Write a protein that binds this ligand. Structure first.
Ligand code: R4V
Length: 290
């Protein structure tokens, strides 16, 4: 409901961008004095079509309903007269994404497990509100302080229909395939369990400290190869169906790797839910925090 008046918005730097969206940091100063609040502003590119324009409206609506300690804070909207859509004004998360953060900050296993737990809390919340995320990756997890993590982007989030257990996707070129379960790649259906597979990939990223050479696209493309034309996805699907998985990250405990493998069961019904993961991670965290 909060309206941001464009006249007090001053652009500081870009925070990120995608094919149809862009996030920039702004100081919102209705005085030009020392009370200026830092905000993250997501805008939809003016050249986006009706599909993305309606998806944007839906994305804005999704963030307005969402309220949880491990979900980025919705702040308000304002008129993007330049793009004739609204702008999503959210809180500014200071330390960035774990993808930006982890390669430069040697973080302990215990803090990593705490992040993992917090991601599950935020996700079990999203799923209780009958929404699937569809883009759960370390790049979408913002670090507030060394003990507070938040899911900070919902560009692909969708409402799970009333009499349904999954959503029909209709796959595109922007689809994060290396974070996707077999049922997503193959049957074009995204379940609540499909987000759990993606969490297993995010957990692998956390345990590799988001090292680019150890990344899911890097490791999967090494296994599939690159002379494989129009068949990266088919070859990814079949390696997953043969039981092939991302390797065990160096210094990752065997029990935690087992948990990652359990999130990556080929059979979606065999995967734990996020509500199931919370007591398990709470307990594995305490264990390594000692
Ligand atoms: C979580 C992922 C990125 C980064 N975002 C945010 N980043 C921050 N803090 C921060 C501090 N340094 N850095 C680099 C980033 N605070 C709030 C944010 F909302 C939102 C976002 N989504 C996007 O960027 C999508 C891709 C697009 F459409 F722009």
């Amino acid at each position: 409901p909060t309206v941001f008046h464009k006249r007090y918005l001053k652009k500081i730097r870009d925070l990120g961008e995608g094919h149809f969206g862009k996030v920039s940091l702004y100081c919102y100063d209705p005085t030009n004095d020392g009370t200026g609040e830092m905000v993250a502003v997501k805008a939809l590119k003016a050249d986006a079509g009706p599909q993305h324009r309606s998806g944007w409206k839906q994305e804005i609506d999704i963030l307005r309903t969402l309220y949880h300690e491990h979900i980025i804070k919705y702040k308000g909207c304002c008129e993007d007269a330049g793009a004739a859509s609204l702008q999503l004004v959210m809180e500014y998360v200071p330390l960035g994404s774990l993808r930006d953060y982890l390669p430069r900050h040697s973080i302990g296993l215990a803090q990593l497990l705490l992040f993992a737990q917090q991601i599950c809390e935020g996700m079990a919340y999203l799923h209780s509100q009958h929404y699937i995320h569809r883009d759960l990756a370390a790049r979408n997890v913002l670090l507030d302080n060394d003990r507070l993590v938040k899911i900070g982007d919902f560009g692909l989030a969708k409402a799970v229909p009333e009499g349904h257990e999954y959503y029909r996707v209709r796959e595109d070129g922007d689809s994060p395939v290396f974070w996707y379960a077999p049922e997503c790649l193959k049957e074009y259906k995204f379940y609540y369990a499909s987000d759990v597979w993606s969490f297993g990939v995010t957990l692998y990223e956390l345990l590799t400290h988001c090292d680019s050479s150890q990344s899911p696209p890097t490791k999967f493309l090494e296994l599939i190869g690159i002379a494989q034309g129009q068949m990266t996805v088919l070859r990814l699907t079949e390696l997953l169906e043969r039981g092939e998985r991302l390797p065990r990250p160096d210094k990752c405990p065997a029990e935690v790797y087992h948990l990652m493998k359990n999130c990556w069961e080929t059979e979606a019904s065999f995967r734990p839910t996020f509500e199931n993961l919370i007591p398990i991670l709470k307990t594995v965290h305490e264990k390594y925090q000692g």
